């Protein structure tokens, strides 16, 4: 981080990060149905 100059660069953290999403995987689960359906509340 020393040899590496300091930026300034768009927001990839913060309140307006332009990071749309992230995910992590470590396993091997059998093809789930709707991978995205949990705790329902409006």
Residues that bind a second copy (CB under 8 A): 1, 4-13, 17-37, 39-42
> What's the min distance (Å) between Cβ of 27 and a second copy?
3
Instruction: Please enumerate in sequence order all residues whose Cβ is within 8 A of that of 34, keeping only pairs 6 or more positions apart, or say none.
Output: none
Using CA of residue 6, residue 4, residue 20, residue 42, what is the dihedral sign? Answer: negative
> What's the min distance (Å) between Cβ of 38 and a second copy?
9
> What's the min distance (Å) between Cβ of 35 and a second copy?
7
């Amino acid at each position: 981080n020393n040899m590496l100059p300091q930026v300034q660069g768009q927001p990839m953290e913060g309140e307006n990060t332009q990071v749309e999403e992230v995910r992590v995987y470590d396993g091997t689960e059998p093809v789930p149905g709707d991978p995205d359906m949990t705790r329902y509340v409006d």
